[PDB]
Amino acid sequence: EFLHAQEEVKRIQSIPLVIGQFLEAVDQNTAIVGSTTGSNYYVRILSTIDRELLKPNASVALHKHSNALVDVLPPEADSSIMMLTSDQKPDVMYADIGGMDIQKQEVREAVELPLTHFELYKQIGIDPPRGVLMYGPPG
Amino acid sequence: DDPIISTHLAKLYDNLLEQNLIRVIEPFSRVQIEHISSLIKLSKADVERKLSQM
C-alpha cells in the first residue's frame, strides 16, 4: 500500500513546473519561497525532498495552480552564458604585456596564487583577500 | 669553475649511483653481486654497503 501511495504522490510535477527560489523555512514540512513573479509566498512542501538539498537559496520547482514546493533544481540559471565554456579566450599571452612587473606580480599573488597554494595561507596566517579592485586613467 | 664541487660530484654521485642501480637490476630479480660488480665498474665493498643503504 505504502509504496504505491508514495508513487501516487508523484503525479505532481510531470510538465507544468515554474521556478521559484527558496527563501526561508518555518519548520518541518513548511517553507517560504518567492517566485519569479515578483511576489512572495507561504507554501507547503512535499515529503519527497531530501532536506540536504535546500536552504541557502535554490531554484526550486513550484506547482502552477497550487503554488507549492515540489522539486529541487540542479545549479543553473546562466552567468550571461556560463564561464566561456571552450574557446572564448582573448588570446593574449604573458610577454605581450610589457613592463608591468609590480602590477602583474601583485595581481598574480592576489588572484592566481591563492587559487593553487590555498593551504600555505592557512599555515602562515595571511588571510588572503576576497575581492581585488583595479583602476587608473583610460588607456 | 664551480665554487662547491663537493655538492655536485659527491651528491650527484650519490644520486647517479642508484641511477645506475635501476639500470643494472630492472632486468632480473635473482642477481649476483660479483657479476654486477663489473657492470657497475666498482669494487663490491661499497656496492654491498651502498646497496644495503638503498
Binding site: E109, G125, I126 | -
Partner: protein, 97 residues
C-alpha cells in the same frame, strides 16, 4: 572645524591621539604579530626602532607584507628578514603622495 561647535558648553571631552612611540609601536607589533607564523629569536624592538614614527595602521601592513615575503619563498615560518624588507617596502610607499 566650526567655531560655533567650539563653544565650551558644547563638547564635553576632547581626546588626543599622539602618533605611537617606541613602546607604543612595540605593543602594536606584539598585537598584530599574534596571527602569523613567527620564529624564535626575533627582535621586535629593532623593527619598532626602524620605524620613523609610523601610524597605527602601517604596522599591520608590515605584518601582512612580512607574511607575503614569507609566502613568496615557499616557506612556512616568518623571520626577521621578511620584516626588514617589509619595513623597506612601507617606507618606500611613504613617499607616494
Amino acid at each position: 572645524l566650526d567655531s560655533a561647535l567650539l563653544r565650551p558648553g558644547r563638547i564635553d571631552r576632547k581626546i588626543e591621539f599622539p602618533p605611537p612611540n617606541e613602546e607604543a609601536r612595540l605593543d602594536i607589533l606584539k598585537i598584530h604579530s599574534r596571527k602569523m607564523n613567527l620564529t624564535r629569536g626575533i627582535n621586535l624592538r629593532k623593527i619598532a626602532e626602524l620605524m620613523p614614527g609610523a601610524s597605527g595602521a602601517e604596522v599591520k601592513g608590515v605584518c601582512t607584507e612580512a607574511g607575503m615575503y614569507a609566502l613568496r619563498e615557499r616557506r612556512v615560518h616568518v623571520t626577521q628578514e621578511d620584516f626588514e624588507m617589509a619595513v623597506a617596502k612601507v617606507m618606500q610607499k611613504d613617499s607616494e603622495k
